[PDB]
């Protein structure tokens, strides 16, 4: 096992992701940030200096379990106090298992401004992957707004709310095109982009040789968009989902929601004299954004040799039946860990959009999360019982709640209590979707749990009821970190609370998390060891720990 | 009989349709134009003074037949030379029959710049309409882009074409809202408009008293948009269409294409304690323009009192079956003129989108119309055989043409020939739609005939064949001046060549007309009397009528 050491500075810079200049949050002058790659078993050490002028910052490693290092999770106000300007924090953690992961900002809406990058983990040195491939292509998907994130943050916190709107561009490895299309030769209404390929917004072309097999690692850090990925004329075979192996299956395209990572295999068994289209189209919301496009360039053909066909037409945004047909087909690879069969706790969380005191907020069992200035992990290790609400948050919603109609908002509160588990508890979480404030509307929401992987026991329509117990999958369920709830539906997951620390479980659409959509889980905090001083040096933790008497 | 005399000037002026300033082409300092209201059989005299600085102007009176006065049709290069800066021209014509008509610019793309207004002809002095209502409401629908018309015109003439795009705002009597909605109440994702009622973009409210019946006259002069009109909780009785009366029927909403006019009657039956929404939304093209909205305000309710329901959602833009369902009902009122049973001429017109010398043009049986600088009416009266092509234009297309494939463009040319008819011929026209340049696309095209009304004999899908004859409605066919062809279909119409003149028959979507989609019909030109000298004063007619010898 090696120690992989990175030394990084976060700083804003001018950049033009879609050839339109704005400021982006860069790491060591790069947008997207540098790739961390390691082998399972290695220690990763990142010393990060903050060089934003007035802003704190933190970096979360999405999908890394942080087992034994809960202080390195990178979530402001839950694992640590943010890192102040001009200061340096060390994130030292181990990578336990292979898979496609990524890292991103977790303080405010800093991740929509560009703070993200890939973190890939390979098998232990000497071991090999269960499947063979010749080459690898890595792809990080995100979305881009031309508006400042500091104005987006303010507009989402105003009465009337000012929603961020659909993004302007879909970004493939940090690049995209606004107001022109690289596939404009198939439709005279489209404006041709003039690009020699040397520009910051020039497509990242996938180069493949004939008759080979390639692993395409795909990860999503979209702030809002749900995407559909298809290459013209090529079957995709799914082999990996969120750092875990799934039972292989072919599909013509995959849907990917923010927080998910997949690895697909392709074989370049097509006509070798032409190049093919890669389309990343928006679904689950009425599209207002052009698709992200690039070429699968069969070498030696000139990359300017355009495909004979158009890009694959993206599937209808609202055909949720086609989306469930994909999602329900995902099962654990033969030989994967099977769940505990009985649970020790089952919690029900109702997801609603609400209007609290004029403000539109998202609530979970009528509590919209407002994170405290004291980091929960420090607060609970030092038993600071005034830092947040000690009263246990609701583990059930009312059976007279009608999920087909707008909230009444009669009892909706903002809060910051923590669900607490005992070390070793098996927990089931049933996520229940409902109608939003507008009549006859319910949306998809990706939910991601920090510091754990869970088994996806099942999905259903309407409200979960006891009749649905026998449909939950206990033989084959997939292990994931991100899961979706569909319009008016439920999704059930199970996990063992075996990892000491305080972990966020939240919706991965960033405006939703900004508006309160997430909860806090804590387990076995009695067993957490020493926390770095910098993760404690704010709020009530620094108040009790800094000895500064008076008269003494 | 009575003469209605108007003293008018057209000048560009600064104005803000949707509260965003731009320049608008206004008449006597106002946008939209002044309404002309007269009774059938009166004589309208308009002395227009062109107050533009470097441009010519013409006004066309859409729907009026120009029976006896072909020189006042107001089509530059067809009935007249355009009126030069600082000059005054007289348009004197007879309004023959009651109905809802309008007038609009007909030189270049000047109508999209705001040059249009209403022309309502009431029954003969002392006669009554064949139905009863207590009031009427006049609505003129149009659409508005934020880019210059002169930059739009250069973009459609460029190689590569810059398509003008979907309109920014739908206007209801010249007002509309952009980036905000007066119906923001029902949706947190919409922005409220901050209007007091006094503004240039504040909605024209429809004031009604309860338990009364009204005639809402609706006309379309849109450059591009096909719209659908609907009133919350109110069914519509269709009683007039294009100045003619139809067999009455009920409907929840009407589709209106550019160039069409309708009168619909409503009765204020509904609950008198509230207001109801008027919604005019986009159909037949994928929408990317919010609907135009206003209120049916039941007096004495406050106009600030919103409806309980959202606006009616516009029917799906691409449900062409629902569209045909409405379109195919329209039948002439009993008592209307039946068509000649036998025809004397039948022409077949293939509507295609082509690429001529790298330019994207529209064409009819492979000729894209380029209008000459000599006005056709003057050229043909004075028998100037060198002013245009005297070869008859193509009257049939190849029956082997695949209307489901992009055009090859092989023989597609630009030209300016004229179809000539004998004074009295009963002419049949089958308009045939086909696939455009993009694979798998055909669009709707509103066709308008000048100086005539025609009977709509029928519509069908695919290619017209002779075996189609028994479906043609010779019994009840509506009398209209505009008719749509649907994607991949034909429409057949019949009219009588009985009005001496040169008349345009074109697509009423202004960009397509700019791109060549239209043809010219001339009949009985040797029966035309004296043409006004200003209408002759350009091109070949000026050259051949100004006596200016040399040596003298
Ligand atoms: C993190 O790693 C660095 C380098 O090995 C070390 O100096 C530092 O003390 C470590 N801190 C923690 C909290 O492990
Ligand atoms: C048009 O009508 C006006 C007013 O009667 C008259 O002065 C003018 O000469 C007429 N011109 C034509 C061409 O009829
Ligand atoms: Cu759409
Ligand atoms: Cu969400
Ligand atoms: Cu057209």
Chain B hits for A288, CB-CB cut-off 8 Å, are 288
Tokens of B234: 């109110």
Chain A hits for B184, CB-CB cut-off 8 Å, are 160
Ligand 1 site-directed mutation target among A1, A3, A45, most atoms within 8 Å of CB: A45
Are the Cβ atoms of A163 and B189 closer than 8 angstroms? yes
Question: Given A189, A360, A437, which is nearest B163 (Cβ)?
Answer: A189
Q: Helix or strand or coil: residue B534?
A: helix
Distance CA B444, CA B257 (A): 9
Class for the domain spanning B131-336: mainly beta
The architecture in CATH of the region B337-552 reads Sandwich (2.60)
DSSP B19-85: SS-EEEEEETTBSSPPPEEEETT-EEEEEEEE--SS--B-EEEET---SS-GGGS--BTTTBPPBPT
Nearest-neighbour CA in chain B from A509: distance (Å): 16
Are the Cβ atoms of A186 and B160 closer than 8 angstroms? no
Residue located via tokens 């002169």: B150
Are the Cβ atoms of A186 and B438 closer than 8 angstroms? yes
Chain B hits for A161, CB-CB cut-off 8 Å, are 188
Nearest-neighbour CA in chain A from B299: distance (Å): 28
Chain A hits for B160, CB-CB cut-off 8 Å, are 188, 192
Question: Closest Cα to residue A430, out of A474, A460, A389?
Answer: A460
Q: Are the C-beta atoms of A171 and A139 separated by less than 8 Å?
A: no
| Total residue length of chain A | 552
Chain B hits for A310, CB-CB cut-off 8 Å, are 439
Instruction: Fill in the DSSP letter of residue A301.
Output: S
Strand order across the beta sheet in which B99-105 lies = B36-39, B116-122, B99-105, B59-62
Residue B194 CA, chain-centre distance (Å), reads 33
Q: How far is the CA of B100 from the centre of ligand 5 (A)?
A: 23
Strand order across the beta sheet in which B276-283 lies = B206-208, B292-298, B276-283, B226-231, B254-256
Signed CA dihedral, A26, A29, A32, A37: sign only: negative
Backbone angles phi, psi at B377, to 5 degrees: -60, -45
Question: Closest Cα to residue A489, out of A520, A455, A458, A462?
Answer: A462
> Which positions in chain B have a beta carbon within 8 angstroms of at least one beta carbon in chain A?
160-163, 165, 184, 186-189, 191-192, 288, 310, 360, 437-439
Q: Are the C-beta atoms of B517 and B507 separated by less than 8 Å?
A: yes
Helix extents (H) in A149-197: 149-155
Q: Are the C-beta atoms of A436 and A442 separated by less than 8 Å?
A: yes
Are the Cβ atoms of B191 and A162 closer than 8 angstroms? yes
Are the Cβ atoms of A160 and B191 closer than 8 angstroms? yes
Burial of A361 (0-12, 13-18, 19+ CB in 10 A): buried
Are the Cβ atoms of A353 and B439 closer than 8 angstroms? no
Distance CA A4, CA A8 (A): 13
Signed CA dihedral, A273, A310, A268, A193: sign only: positive
Distance CA A211, CA A209 (A): 7
Strand intervals (E) in B196-291: 206-208, 213-220, 226-231, 236-241, 244-251, 254-256, 261-267, 276-283
Q: Give me the residues near ligand 5 (ion), CB cutoff below 5 Å.
A: B 445, 507, 509, 512
Q: Are the C-beta atoms of A57 and A110 separated by less than 8 Å?
A: yes
Burial of A337 (0-12, 13-18, 19+ CB in 10 A): exposed
Cis bond before residue A471 (omega within 30° of 0)? no
Residue located via tokens 């691409």: B318
Distance CA B233, CA B132 (A): 21
Residue located via tokens 């409401």: B137
The domains of chain B are located at: 1-130, 131-336, 337-552
Q: Helix or strand or coil: residue A137?
A: strand
Any known ligand binding at A514?
no
Cis bond before residue A160 (omega within 30° of 0)? yes
Backbone angles phi, psi at B46, to 5 degrees: -125, 120
The binding-site residues of ligand 1, defined as CB within 6 angstroms of any ligand atom, are A 45, 90, 92, 532
Q: Whose CA is nearest to atom 13 of ligand 2?
A: B532
| Ligand 2 pocket residue status of B41, Cβ below 6 Å | no
Tokens of B227: 């719209």
Closest atom of ligand 1 to CA, residue A45: 2
Any known ligand binding at A132?
no
Signed CA dihedral, B68, B73, B78, B84: sign only: positive
Are the Cβ atoms of B160 and A439 closer than 8 angstroms? no
Strand intervals (E) in A200-291: 206-208, 213-220, 226-231, 236-241, 244-251, 254-256, 261-267, 276-283
- The CB-side HSE value for A208 (13 A sphere, CA atoms) comes to 33
Element spanning A203, H or E: none
Please give the residue of chain B at the shortest CA–CA distance from A359: B188
Q: Are the C-beta atoms of B341 and B474 separated by less than 8 Å?
A: yes
Q: Helix or strand or coil: residue A94?
A: strand
| Total residue length of chain B | 552
Give the burial string for A401-419 (b: 16+ CB within 10 Å, else e): bebeebbeeeebeebbbbb
Q: Whose CA is nearest to atom 11 of ligand 2?
A: B90
The residues pairing with A22 across neighbouring beta strands, listed in sequence order, are A15
Question: Given B165, B288, B437, which is nearest A188 (Cβ)?
Answer: B437
Any known ligand binding at A508?
yes
Question: What is the β-pairing status of strands A99-105 and B99-105?
Answer: unpaired
Q: How far is the CA of A109 from the centre of ligand 1 (A)?
A: 28
Distance CA A182, CA A193 (A): 6
Question: Closest Cα to residue A113, out of A229, A33, A226?
Answer: A33
Query: Considering all CA atoms of chain A, what is the largest pairwise distance in Å, rounded to the nearest integer?
Result: 85
> Which positions in chain A have a beta carbon within 8 angstroms of at least one beta carbon in chain B?
160-163, 186-189, 191-192, 288, 310, 353, 360, 437-439
What determination technique applies here? X-ray
Residues 6+ apart with CB under 8 A from B324: B459, B486
Are the Cβ atoms of B161 and A310 closer than 8 angstroms? no
Residue located via tokens 């709707």: B444
Tokens of A428: 């089931």
Q: Are the C-beta atoms of A102 and A221 separated by less than 8 Å?
A: yes
Residues 6+ apart with CB under 8 A from A166: A224, A225, A282, A285, A287, A288, A289
Chain B hits for A192, CB-CB cut-off 8 Å, are 160
Give the CA distances from residue A3 to residues A42, A44, A93, B150, in Å, rounded to whole numbers and listed in that order: 6, 6, 10, 65
Q: How far is the CA of B484 from the centre of ligand 5 (A)?
A: 9
Burial of A507 (0-12, 13-18, 19+ CB in 10 A): buried
Residue located via tokens 């190849």: B398
User: Rounded to 5 degrees, what angle do the CA atoms A494, A497, A501 make?
Assistant: 135
State which CATH number among 2.60.40.10, 1.10.150.20, 1.10.490.10, 2.60.40.420 fits the domain covering B1-130: 2.60.40.420
Q: Are the C-beta atoms of A374 and A544 separated by less than 8 Å?
A: no
Q: How far is the CA of A446 from the centre of ligand 4 (A)?
A: 6
Nearest-neighbour CA in chain B from A106: distance (Å): 25
Distance CA A282, CA A522 (A): 35
Residue located via tokens 């207001």: B275
Question: Given B165, B191, B360, which is nearest A188 (Cβ)?
Answer: B360
Are the Cβ atoms of A192 and B160 closer than 8 angstroms? yes
Distance CA A481, CA A505 (A): 10
Torsion, CA B26, CA B32, CA B38, CA B43, rounded to 10: 30
Q: Whose CA is nearest to atom 12 of ligand 1?
A: A92
The residues pairing with A144 across neighbouring beta strands, listed in sequence order, are A169
Q: How far is the CA of B531 from the centre of ligand 2 (A)?
A: 12
Q: Are the C-beta atoms of B224 and B143 separated by less than 8 Å?
A: yes
Distance CA A478, CA A333 (A): 8
Q: How far is the CA of A480 from the centre of ligand 1 (A)?
A: 30
The residues pairing with A44 across neighbouring beta strands, listed in sequence order, are A4, A93
Are the Cβ atoms of B188 and A162 closer than 8 angstroms? no
Domains B1-130 and B131-336 equal at CATH topology level: yes
Q: Are the C-beta atoms of A483 and A462 separated by less than 8 Å?
A: no
Interface test with A, best of B185, B438, B441, B509 (most A CBs within 10 A): B438
């Amino acid at each position: 096992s090696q120690i992989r050491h990175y030394k990084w500075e976060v700083e804003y810079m001018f950049w033009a992701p879609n050839c339109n200049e704005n400021i982006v949050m860069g790491i060591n002058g790069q947008f997207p940030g540098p790739t961390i790659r390691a082998n399972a078993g290695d220690s990763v050490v990142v010393e990060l200096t903050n060089k934003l002028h007035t802003e704190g910052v933190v970096i979360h490693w999405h999908g890394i379990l942080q087992r034994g290092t809960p202080w390195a999770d990178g979530t402001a106000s839950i694992s640590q106090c943010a890192i102040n300007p001009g200061e340096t924090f060390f994130y030292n953690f181990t990578v336990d298992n292979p898979g496609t992961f990524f890292y991103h900002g977790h303080l405010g809406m800093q991740r929509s401004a560009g703070l993200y990058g890939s973190l890939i983990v390979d098998p232990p040195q000497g071991k090999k992957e269960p499947f063979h491939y010749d080459g690898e292509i890595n792809l990080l998907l995100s979305d881009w707004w031309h508006q400042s994130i500091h104005k987006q943050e303010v507009g989402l916190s105003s009465k009337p709310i000012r929603w961020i709107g659909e993004p302007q561009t879909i970004l493939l490895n940090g690049r995209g095109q606004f107001d022109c299309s690289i596939a404009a030769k198939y439709d005279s209404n489209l404006e041709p982009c003039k690009l020699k390929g040397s520009e910051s917004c020039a497509p990242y072309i996938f180069h493949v040789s004939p008759k080979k097999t390639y692993r395409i690692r795909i990860a999503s850090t979209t702030a809002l968009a749900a995407l559909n990925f298809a290459i013209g004329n090529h079957q995709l075979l799914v082999v990996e989902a969120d750092g875990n192996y799934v039972q292989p299956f072919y599909t013509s395209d995959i849907d990917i929601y923010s927080g998910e990572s997949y690895s697909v295999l392709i074989t370049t068994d097509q006509n070798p004299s032409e190049n093919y289209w890669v389309s990343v189209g928006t679904r689950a919301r009425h599209p207002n954004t052009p698709p992200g496009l690039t070429l699968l360039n069969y070498l030696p053909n000139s990359v300017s040799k355009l495909p004979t066909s158009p890009p694959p037409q993206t599937p209808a945004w609202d055909d949720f039946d086609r989306s469930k047909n994909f999602t329900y087909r995902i099962t654990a690879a033969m030989g994967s860990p099977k769940p505990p069969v009985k649970f020790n706790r089952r919690i029900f969380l109702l997801n609603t959009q609400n209007v609290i005191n004029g403000y539109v907020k998202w609530a979970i069992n009528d509590v919209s999360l407002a994170l405290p200035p004291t980091p929960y992990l420090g607060a609970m290790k030092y038993n600071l019982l005034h830092a947040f609400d000690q009263n246990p948050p609701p583990e059930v919603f009312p059976e007279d709640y009608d999920i087909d109609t707008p909230p009444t908002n009669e009892k909706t509160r903002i809060g910051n209590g923590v669900y607490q588990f005992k070390i070793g508890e098996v927990v089931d979480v049933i996520l229940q979707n409902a109608n939003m404030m507008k009549e006859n509307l319910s949306e998809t929401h990706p939910w991601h749990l920090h510091g754990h992987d869970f088994w996806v026991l099942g999905y259903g329509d309407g409200k979960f009821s006891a009749e649905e117990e026998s449909s939950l999958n206990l033989k084959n369920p997939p292990l994931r970190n991100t899961v979706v709830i569909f319009p008016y539906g439920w999704t059930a997951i199970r996990f063992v609370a075996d990892n000491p620390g305080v972990w966020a479980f939240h919706c991965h659409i960033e405006p939703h998390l900004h508006m309160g959509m997430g909860v806090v889980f804590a387990e076995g905090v009695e067993k957490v060891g020493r926390i770095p001083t910098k993760a404690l040096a704010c709020g009530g933790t620094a108040k009790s720990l800094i000895n500064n008497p008076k008269n003494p």
